[PDB]
């Protein structure tokens, strides 16, 4: 009866028979790719095509995670870092161009969305930081891509258990919350922090009805997609299982559970969704990219004009 979906990953650069089978379950709604799955844009495009032949409705995401190493031969477009963009007189335009460039290439290789490091708002003048991230978001949207931020509500220092942050809500409100409050009406999706704020709630933000429903949906009026944090944590030696955690995440109001780097865990989370007979959240297809896969994107005028602006500003070449 209830609503939810799973986002998972694969181990390699091409699909296994096991991947093909698990992709057919309708409770699987997403796939994310990482460096280990990427050889070059051409192989990424062909991989996305193979997945869409199984499931045209999958949301396909690439995690950029602060640069993916060595896209040297026919690689992905190299974009300036946001700190370099900020120190220009036309930083807002340049951030727009960067978001449009990244989103245009990502969808040209058949993906729906990118998890971009500039939209990690708590691991980055903060009002100017919000302004430049908003401009990056306009570029992404102009290319037809939905924009994901993290980590709500914010915690960018250190902790091997799960971090706890002892600040009041009014102290969080006047600090880490401010980027989110400002981009909430512009972001299409958010990922929560793997942090407990005991002054506010005893559960991590990603399993807290109070963080997700009362502060985020209520106070911040956010109506986009809530991704869970990583419900597998493969290698961290946690106890509990991806199956109990995805139940906990959907209970709190997550739309889609992420189970990365642990196929065993993804299968347990999937069995959990099957028993629930979940159907996809009505929100979910907001993340579908309006762009399309193609190979001529680098010869288009808007692409060459975006690069010319970056170059005039001294940022590339
Ligand atoms: Zn963060």
Swiss-Prot record:
The active site is at residue 229. Belongs to the glycosyl hydrolase 3 family. NagZ subfamily. Substrate binds at residues 63, 71, 150-151. Pathway: Cell wall biogenesis; peptidoglycan recycling. Plays a role in peptidoglycan recycling by cleaving the terminal beta-1,4-linked N-acetylglucosamine (GlcNAc) from peptide-linked peptidoglycan fragments, giving rise to free GlcNAc, anhydro-N-acetylmuramic acid and anhydro-N-acetylmuramic acid-linked peptides. Contributes to intrinsic fosfomycin resistance in P.aeruginosa. This is Beta-hexosaminidase. Its EC number is 3.2.1.52. PANTHER family: BETA-HEXOSAMINIDASE, BETA-HEXOSAMINIDASE-RELATED. Its main location: cytoplasm. The lineage of its organism: Bacteria, Pseudomonadati, Pseudomonadota, Gammaproteobacteria, Pseudomonadales. GO terms for biological process: carbohydrate metabolic process; cell division; cell wall organization; peptidoglycan biosynthetic process; peptidoglycan turnover; regulation of cell shape; response to antibiotic. It comes from the Bacteria.
